[PDB]
Amino acid sequence: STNLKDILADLIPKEQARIKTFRQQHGKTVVGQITVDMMYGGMRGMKGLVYETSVLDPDEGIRFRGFSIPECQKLLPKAKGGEEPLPEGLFWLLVTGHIPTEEQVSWLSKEWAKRAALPSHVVTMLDNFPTNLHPMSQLSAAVTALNSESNFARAYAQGISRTKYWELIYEDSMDLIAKLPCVAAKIYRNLYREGSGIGAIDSNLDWSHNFTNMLGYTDHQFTELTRLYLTIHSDHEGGNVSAHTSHLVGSALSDPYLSFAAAMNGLAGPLHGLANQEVLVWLTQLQKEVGKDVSDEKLRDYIWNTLNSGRVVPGYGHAVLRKTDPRYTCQREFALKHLPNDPMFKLVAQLYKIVPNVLLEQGKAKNPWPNVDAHSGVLLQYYGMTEMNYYTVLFGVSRALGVLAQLIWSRALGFPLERPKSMSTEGLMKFVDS
Amino acid sequence: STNLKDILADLIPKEQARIKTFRQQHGKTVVGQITVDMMYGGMRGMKGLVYETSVLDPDEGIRFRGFSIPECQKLLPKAKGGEEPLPEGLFWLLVTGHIPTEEQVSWLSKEWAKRAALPSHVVTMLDNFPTNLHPMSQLSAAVTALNSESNFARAYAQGISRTKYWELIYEDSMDLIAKLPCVAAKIYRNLYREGSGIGAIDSNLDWSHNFTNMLGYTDHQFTELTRLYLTIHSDHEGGNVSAHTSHLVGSALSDPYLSFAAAMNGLAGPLHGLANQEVLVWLTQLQKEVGKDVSDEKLRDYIWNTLNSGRVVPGYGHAVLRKTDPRYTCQREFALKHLPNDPMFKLVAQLYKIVPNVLLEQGKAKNPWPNVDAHSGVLLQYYGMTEMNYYTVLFGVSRALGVLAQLIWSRALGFPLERPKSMSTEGLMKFVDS
Numbered sequence A, B: 001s002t003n004l005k006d007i008l009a010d011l012i013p014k015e016q017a018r019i020k021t022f023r024q025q026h027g028k029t030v031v032g033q034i035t036v037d038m039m040y041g042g043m044r045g046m047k048g049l050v051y052e053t054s055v056l057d058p059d060e061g062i063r064f065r066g067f068s069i070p071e072c073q074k075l076l077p078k079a080k081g082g083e084e085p086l087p088e089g090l091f092w093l094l095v096t097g098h099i100p101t102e103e104q105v106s107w108l109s110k111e112w113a114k115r116a117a118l119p120s121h122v123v124t125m126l127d128n129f130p131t132n133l134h135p136m137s138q139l140s141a142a143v144t145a146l147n148s149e150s151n152f153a154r155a156y157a158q159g160i161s162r163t164k165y166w167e168l169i170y171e172d173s174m175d176l177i178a179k180l181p182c183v184a185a186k187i188y189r190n191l192y193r194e195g196s197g198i199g200a201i202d203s204n205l206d207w208s209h210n211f212t213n214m215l216g217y218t219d220h221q222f223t224e225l226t227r228l229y230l231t232i233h234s235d236h237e238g239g240n241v242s243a244h245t246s247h248l249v250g251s252a253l254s255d256p257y258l259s260f261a262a263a264m265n266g267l268a269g270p271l272h273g274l275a276n277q278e279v280l281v282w283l284t285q286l287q288k289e290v291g292k293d294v295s296d297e298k299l300r301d302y303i304w305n306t307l308n309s310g311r312v313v314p315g316y317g318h319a320v321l322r323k324t325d326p327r328y329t330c331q332r333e334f335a336l337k338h339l340p341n342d343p344m345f346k347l348v349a350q351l352y353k354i355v356p357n358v359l360l361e362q363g364k365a366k367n368p369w370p371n372v373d374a375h376s377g378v379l380l381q382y383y384g385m386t387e388m389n390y391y392t393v394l395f396g397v398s399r400a401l402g403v404l405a406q407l408i409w410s411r412a413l414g415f416p417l418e419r420p421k422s423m424s425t426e427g428l429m430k431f432v433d434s
């Protein structure tokens, strides 16, 4: 009823049969060609893995189990007296395919409070890390260390049936999601607040509010932004580096802690997780010359004096998108309601007219619209979260929801080891002659 | 002449231009098809990536830059008073594609001795790790924490030219390889020798001997085993989960420390790097159930009786190999020479006689011959290394050579972010019906 685990248990047989029917109809059907260029080009355009939780709709954005972001904002439970989707509900949806009821989210909230405790060895390890060790490295190291708590790893050693893998994966995943805020908040407080303590979990708060409590914030609107932020960054298909890493490492039957920590190492990469900070450095830098008020000359110069120089207007491209990311619109509506008078937001609102001066003149992007990362930093900074090195941790905590919801399903559905074939250049040259 | 970095700087242009030409002419050549089954089946049989350092023919086994393991055992430098190939030479081959001279191996040994220091925070972290934190978890976490030393991470933030990525990757890779034995031997000692100290690096020893010193072994034969073991586990194409994880995380420009720690999380998965242990647990069990002094039939009975209950013979089969793994033969040859009368070896040897037979009469197997992991456990147990949870640490330290050699080349050649497209079951079903 409220126990997500039993609801999952009832869903899994239906999904297994649906896949079995489809593979029996179409297993041998060709869905794509592989070219030499796709192998050299990081598998671009190659349909390579199944990933159930989210799908990129080319005209409406990311859908979560079919629901668009605006749909999730309408339908998902909010905290009482609040406007923003609770990330608990998002997880419920990713796991079940169903929009939760208020009571389901409430149950899930209390489940994560109960499982939140950190083992002292992780606490010690985090307390001992130096300030020159990047927050994302701290996050990945601590999650790896948490695998001492893995129920899945122990049960596998004792020869548990394949038919039960999903159960222990579920337990580990809920445990991990529950702990993430505590870990994330210890990192923040140790780096940016002189090692002061995270305080206690409250058995009756939502995940996001426990999170902002432990970070040391007390600002309803900040907690509301966190709720929205954790919801919208949660999943973005399977092919992104963090999701795919988790998928790949998970397919070797590494437990959720190891799979997630590997993912965070992937997220830590500059071409994945650093877009947020780039933008905010640029915007801050833009109020060097501009001051508070300007024009498109101001803008198109760099726009052309940068895009035609070599670099970019940060936060106006993607790897497969094609329209104003709903993830941006999300934050914009947020900012228009709650901080209309903020200079930087105002600048960001100004940039949303100009840089879309159809930058297709150069023809180099195939995307003249702002992505998620264009809006995120200003909002964080407004609420007093200024330590940009930390922003990708927030992204990580969010992404946990997506990749763990899929990990449960990968094991439920008996997905095998990911093991493609590689070739050398020499090898490929000989293969093509024949 | 001897500076590997200068030799590599000279090779890179040649190969860039070679790939540029190949992709202009043959970039659109189709080298395979994707089916629905492949997407569900972990990309099995899918030509997915270019990986230059090694290629695994199903037929004759792994080749390292065109050389087989027997060709390498012969051609690669040995230590003075030594029979086994030094991993240093293996690494030089993978990086350069050339067999190194004695002098180049000597120079690389001194380079790795000089770069072997750990920062105090990494020492502290290892020494505080509890004894219930698995060695692979310690290894991954410690390597993540070393990324505070990353030259590449700091260069990238200050805006280095793409043309120079490979140089910082190379440096960071040389630093990590040098440090790994120190990390690995600290783990070994903290867990299995009540925290006794690892001692010093000798600037005139090879890498494998420094390592066995730090571990607390001073048996010349065990050093020779280590040299052989580190050489042969070094690389196995790009499609295995450890190399692939490293390739994937690297392609987001995560530094070598993060890419390697991610790979170890992959390696720690039961379907990737625990077959060694699994083999040894089965052999030890078998040795009780049929006595040490064993017949040829009672052994064939047990293997027959294993196959019926529906249970695997560990150490036989592979995801692509379809004949005897030359990394097995290597270990066999070493055993015949050094421990022919070892009860456990005899049994392993007997099983090579017996087991391939029976899997032929099955028709289920495809690969009825042993992999590397069938032979490794008993060689380690023989020399006094009986802590099975540690075995995969050795594999990891070996695999560093291969994945880092390739990581240098992936950056040198400008390999982009790995980003295949994922589909849901629902989405796939609709795509095929189109």
Ligand SMILES: CC(C)(COP(=O)(O)OP(=O)(O)OC[C@H]1O[C@@H](n2cnc3c(N)ncnc32)[C@H](O)[C@@H]1OP(=O)(O)O)[C@@H](O)C(=O)NCCC(=O)NCCS
Pocket: B271, B272, B275, B311, B312, B313, B314, B315, B316, B317, B318, B319, B320, B364, B365, B366, B367, B371, B373
């Ligand atoms: C390595 C391995 C996982 C690859 O198998 P695979 O790619 O999934 O598939 P195969 O084509 O080998 O499978 C053919 C059939 O023979 C079986 N088979 C494979 N190796 C077998 C073995 N050593 N003993 C018994 N049966 C075996 C498979 O399970 C399969 O049976 P099924 O169709 O009834 O399910 C498999 O050979 C195995 O189980 N090996 C034992 C563990 C090991 O040694 N691992 C180290 C290498 S990674």
Ligand SMILES: O=C([O-])CC(=O)C(=O)O
Pocket: A419, B235, B236, B239, B240, B241, B242, B272, B319
């Ligand atoms: O090749 C594989 O998939 C697993 C393996 O043997 C290795 O990585 O060496």
